[PDB]
Design a protein around this nucleic acid. Structure first.
Ligand SMILES: [Mg+2]
Ligand SMILES: [Mg+2]
Ligand SMILES: [Mg+2]
Ligand SMILES: [Mg+2]
Ligand SMILES: [Mg+2]
Ligand SMILES: [Mg+2]
Ligand SMILES: [Mg+2]
Ligand SMILES: [Mg+2]
Ligand SMILES: [Mg+2]
Ligand SMILES: [Mg+2]
Ligand SMILES: [Mg+2]
Ligand SMILES: [Mg+2]
Ligand SMILES: [Mg+2]
Ligand SMILES: [Mg+2]
Ligand SMILES: [Mg+2]
Ligand SMILES: [Mg+2]
Ligand SMILES: [Mg+2]
Ligand SMILES: [Mg+2]
Ligand SMILES: [Mg+2]
Ligand SMILES: [Mg+2]
Ligand SMILES: [Mg+2]
Ligand SMILES: [Mg+2]
Ligand SMILES: [Mg+2]
Ligand SMILES: [Mg+2]
Ligand SMILES: [Mg+2]
Ligand SMILES: [Mg+2]
Ligand SMILES: [Mg+2]
Ligand SMILES: [Mg+2]
Ligand SMILES: [Mg+2]
Ligand SMILES: [Zn+2]
Lengths: 77, 91, 96, 135, 251, 112
RNA sequence: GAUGGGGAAGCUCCGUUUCAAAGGCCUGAUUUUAUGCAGGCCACCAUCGAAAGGGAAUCCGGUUAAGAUUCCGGAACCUGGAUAUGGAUUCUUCACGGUAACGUAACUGAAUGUGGAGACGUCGGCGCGAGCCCUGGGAGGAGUUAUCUUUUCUUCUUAACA
RNA sequence: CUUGUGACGGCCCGUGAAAAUCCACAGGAAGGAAUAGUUUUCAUGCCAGGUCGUACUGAUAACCGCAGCAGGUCUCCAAGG
RNA sequence: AGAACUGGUACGGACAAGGGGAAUCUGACUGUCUAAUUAAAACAUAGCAUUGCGAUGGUCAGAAAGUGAUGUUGACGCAAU
């Protein structure tokens, strides 16, 4: 329910010691009339709120999923 | 244009209640709805809120007065008498 | 009366109209005399005497309200206070 | 004659320090580029000293005499000049136009004016200036 | 016969006054040490319309001299009182409109209103809109004052009773004709259930002394002696005279 | 042209039972009740709606931080700013007048 | 409508702050120990009375033979209570900036007092919002087609909360 | 069109509830730091949220009129021409 | 708003939708009542007039009361016609 725009804050937020699960949503969006790109959403289920991080870059998305802690349950959908 | 000859504000009562009664009701409502000078702010902004309550739109002052006018003649006579008694008793 | 002296001030000298203008002038020390209408808010009156006393300025109280003072200076609106910056050709500063 | 001089005590009527005694340190009648209006460089007190009686001994006196000063640019329209006065010599140098525009010299000027205020208040000088305006 | 209407009011079933919207009982400030030894100052805050009352109310705020509180009083507003006006009450108060000077310390010919009949009962006399009391003279020994009530009767009351200077605001109210059963309906809707009134002569004889007959007529004399019992007092009670008043009252 | 119904058991169009028809992600029209509108706080002296303060129902003020309920001036969340200015002016002037009156009184008593 | 009271032979009646000795509230002190002494404070002075008045806080999708704002899934909020970390602030002890209206992530505060909200009529017109109605383009589906009809109907939606 | 809302204006011898409850301010009692504190109106974190109603009709058949009676019974939403 | 053209003079084409005038009696008017035979010229009403009362009071209630209604009232009021 709360959006996060800082990657450092997000990666820190993945180590809050209360979060157990997260999900990664892939969307197909259009930047303008010609070019469709792939939207990726990072949602971390906090104890009290849901934090969503949105990335419009595929490369950054790959680097970030690579950088998630292994102890966190990730869902692909 | 001039809409009525004599009824004026009491045209809303139509042909009923009798001529004379409508006459003095007009005579009083004209005073009731009129605008009065602010004794404090000096403007034509004093209106009647309720019976006897006269307040000024600007300067936010309210003065207790007559039910149908800002002040009656008896009030003026009383105020003058009080002033006479004050300047008689202090000197 | 005194209104003729005021009129000659207006036609000859310089002056200000209004509370903000007069307090600004009195703050700068350019005011020689101030005139207060009868029904001026007494708190405003009192701060005016305090300012004048701080500025060593003569004070006169108009025997009339805002409307009478405004007509005295020859204006179609009401004036609560006037400040005299220069007499020009008048005599109010010497008398009263 | 103009009266807003470099030693007059005034009262702030508007702003965060409304009702606080201030002393004019540096006047500016014809405004400035940063402030196109008649403004000053007053120094005041935010937390007035508490009342002290015979009963308090040797530390409650010290705690109850603490002074929190402040320095600000204020429009002349937001001051009431007083007939009182309080000379400024020990901290007229530190308070200046360039004393502001960065936080540091503000705070070490506040320190000097705090020292000057508490020194005067320790002696029997300017009780009215240190007395809180009740309203 | 049946119990007549005027008897039926005393039970107070539906005949009690409608007191929802009234702002409170309009009483003077209680008579304490300050008033009988000096004067006290007050501030007029609100001038409020009172439901079921022609005169407006004056809501004056006082200071409690014994405890740090803000006693608030409800006065009847005199004509000429304004919000923010300072009000002085006490023996040593200055004789000004809205002040509450005791009748002992006020010269003859003064106008007062809301006058106490005994000291400390917080105002009885002359409490209606446009009404006032004349002070005629004093009796310094065995302190005593003679005053003129709105009824025209002369009454002698104690010199320590209080009364506010001025005339009750709202005068001339009864001058405007109502023109409408609706206007009277709304007027009495906030006072009590006493309207409309049915003529006794148009009643059956079981309902009223006047009722009955093949023509609407009272039959007997309509002037009822004061020695009559409840249920007979229907008409002109203890009428000294009757008929149109031609000439001076000679009071 | 769907027609909605009250979502609660009070069928009377009272103040506490106002509704606002809204469209849901399900594509249907569903009535939703709206709470009574908040009234702005008012100044103690000038009687006007003093600004800078959040406007909520009275109980809901217990939930928000101190910042939303006050201003950083004396009489912050209580009195109008112009009211504060005029009362400061009144206080100063009347106190100075009190000193003036006492010096005049001691002068006149010393004269006789 | 109890109580203190006052009537009535009595069933009971009056009265709801009245001719009353009409109480609990916080801090602490003592750490035989539990709570009395240490204090201070305060003066309404029972209770009942509204499923349409006032009122702390929830929405969406799905599910049953019959329940759903109650169940399931997801996402919030309020009250009460404990609390730990981060943040904030302090050597000028209890923050700063803006001339000002005022702003922020915070940014001590008891007794007592003041103020605000709760909290408010009806009617006429005007502005603004939401929903509905109308309609264009486009992407699907259905109907009529002896003849005509870029045609007729229909789906294109986004809650509380931040 | 329905409805909500704002600024208004008209009307009154009618000026059109109260309480619970929450907050702010004034006040400065008290408590407070430097080798360390103070702070839970800032963020995050932990636990709990008791009791009763919840189906259905609400009317030319589920209510009252002896009844499966052309009677009576409060209210919400209201498409096109 | 106007102008041509057109039709078995039709055209607010269904629906929807005031008859009018001259007078007399009576009530001024809006309003209310005999649920289930009488809605009126009856009642009420605004206006007018009269009476009582300054509270240790007027009118009225209770068996009594340290009891009540008017009365959160005070003659521009309350009460009775
Ligand atoms: Mg009746
Ligand atoms: Mg009959
Ligand atoms: Mg009989
Ligand atoms: Mg008869
Ligand atoms: Mg409710
Ligand atoms: Mg703010
Ligand atoms: Mg805000
Ligand atoms: Mg009882
Ligand atoms: Mg209850
Ligand atoms: Mg309820
Ligand atoms: Mg209500
Ligand atoms: Mg909700
Ligand atoms: Mg169901
Ligand atoms: Mg659930
Ligand atoms: Mg900060
Ligand atoms: Mg309020
Ligand atoms: Mg959205
Ligand atoms: Mg409606
Ligand atoms: Mg209105
Ligand atoms: Mg159910
Ligand atoms: Mg159900
Ligand atoms: Mg149902
Ligand atoms: Mg139904
Ligand atoms: Mg139905
Ligand atoms: Mg049945
Ligand atoms: Mg019949
Ligand atoms: Mg009939
Ligand atoms: Mg009749
Ligand atoms: Mg009586
Ligand atoms: Zn005014």
């Amino acid at each position: 329910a709360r959006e996060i725009t800082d990657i450092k804050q997000f990666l820190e937020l993945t180590r809050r010691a209360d979060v157990k699960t997260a999900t990664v949503k892939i969307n197909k969006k259009l930047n303008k009339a010609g070019k469709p790109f792939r939207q990726t959403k990072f949602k971390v289920r906090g104890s009290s709120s849901l934090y969503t991080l949105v990335i419009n870059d595929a490369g950054k998305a790959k680097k970030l999923i690579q950088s998630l802690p292994p102890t966190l349950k990730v869902n692909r959908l | 244009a001039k809409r009525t000859k004599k009824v004026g504000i009491t045209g809303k009562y139509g042909v009923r209640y009798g001529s004379s009664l409508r006459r003095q009701v007009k005579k009083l409502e004209i005073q009731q709805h009129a605008r009065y000078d602010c004794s404090f702010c000096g403007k034509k902004t004093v209106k009647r809120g309720a019976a006897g309550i006269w307040t000024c739109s600007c300067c936010k002052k309210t003065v207790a007065g007559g039910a149908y006018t800002v002040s009656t003649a008896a009030a003026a006579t009383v105020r003058s008498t009080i002033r006479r008694l004050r300047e008689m008793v202090e000197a | 009366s005194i209104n003729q002296k005021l009129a000659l001030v207006i036609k000859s000298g310089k002056y200000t109209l209004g509370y903000k203008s007069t307090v600004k002038s009195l703050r700068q020390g350019k005011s020689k005399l101030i005139i207060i209408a009868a029904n001026t808010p007494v708190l405003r009156k009192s701060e005016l005497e305090y300012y004048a006393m701080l500025s060593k300025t003569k004070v006169y109280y108009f025997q009339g309200g805002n409307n009478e003072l405004g007509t005295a200076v020859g204006k179609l609106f009401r004036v609560g206070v006037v400040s005299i910056l220069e007499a020009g050709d008048s005599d109010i500063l010497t008398t009263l | 004659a103009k009266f807003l001089k470099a030693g007059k005590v005034a009262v702030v009527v508007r702003g965060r320090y409304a009702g606080k005694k201030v002393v004019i340190v540096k006047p500016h009648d014809e405004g400035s580029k940063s402030h196109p209006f008649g403004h000053a460089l007053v120094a005041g007190i935010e937390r007035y000293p508490l009342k002290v009686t015979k009963k308090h001994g040797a530390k409650k006196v010290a705690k109850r005499t603490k002074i929190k000063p402040f320095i600000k640019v204020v429009n002349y329209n937001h001051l009431l000049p007083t007939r009182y006065t309080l000379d400024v010599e020990a901290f007229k140098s530190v308070v200046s136009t360039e004393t502001f525009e960065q936080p540091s010299q503000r705070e070490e000027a506040k320190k000097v004016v705090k020292k000057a205020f508490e020194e005067r208040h320790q002696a029997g000088k300017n009780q009215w200036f240190f007395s809180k305006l009740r309203f | 016969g049946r119990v007549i209407r005027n008897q039926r009011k005393g039970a107070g079933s539906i005949f009690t006054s409608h007191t929802r919207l009234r702002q409170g009982a309009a009483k003077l400030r209680t008579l304490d040490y300050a008033e009988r030894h000096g004067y006290i100052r007050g501030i007029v805050k609100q001038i409020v319309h009172d439901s079921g009352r022609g005169a407006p109310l004056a809501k004056v705020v006082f200071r409690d001299p014994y405890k740090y509180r803000l006693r608030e009083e409800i006065f009847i507003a005199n004509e000429g009182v304004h919000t923010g006006q300072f009000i002085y009450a006490g023996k040593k108060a200055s004789l000004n409109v809205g002040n509450v000077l005791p009748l002992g310390s006020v010269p003859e010919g003064t106008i007062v209103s809301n006058v106490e009949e005994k000291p400390g009962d917080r105002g009885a006399l002359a409490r209606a809109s446009g009404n006032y009391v004349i002070i005629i003279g004093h009796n310094p020994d065995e302190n005593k004052t003679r005053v003129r009530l709105p009824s025209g009767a002369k009454k002698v009351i104690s010199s320590d009773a209080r009364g506010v200077i001025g005339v009750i605001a709202g005068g001339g109210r009864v001058d405007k004709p109502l023109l409408k059963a609706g206007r009277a309906f709304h007027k009495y809707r906030l006072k009590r259930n006493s309207w409309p009134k049915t003529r006794g002569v148009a009643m059956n004889p079981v309902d009223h002394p006047h009722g009955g007959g093949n023509h609407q007529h009272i039959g007997k004399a309509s002037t009822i002696s004061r020695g009559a019992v409840s249920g007979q007092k229907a008409g002109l009670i203890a009428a000294r005279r009757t008929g149109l008043l031609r000439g001076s009252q000679k009071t | 042209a769907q027609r909605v119904t009250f979502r609660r058991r009070n069928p009377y169009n009272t103040r506490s039972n106002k509704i606002k028809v809204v469209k849901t992600p399900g594509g249907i029209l569903r009535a939703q009740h709206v709470k009574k509108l908040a009234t702005r706080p008012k100044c103690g002296d000038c009687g006007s709606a003093l600004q800078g303060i959040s406007t909520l129902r009275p109980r809901q003020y217990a939930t928000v931080s101190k910042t939303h309920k006050t201003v950083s001036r004396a009489y912050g969340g209580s009195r109008c700013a112009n009211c504060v200015k005029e009362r400061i002016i009144r206080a100063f002037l009347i106190e100075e007048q009190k000193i003036v009156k006492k010096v005049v009184k001691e002068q006149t008593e010393a004269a006789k």
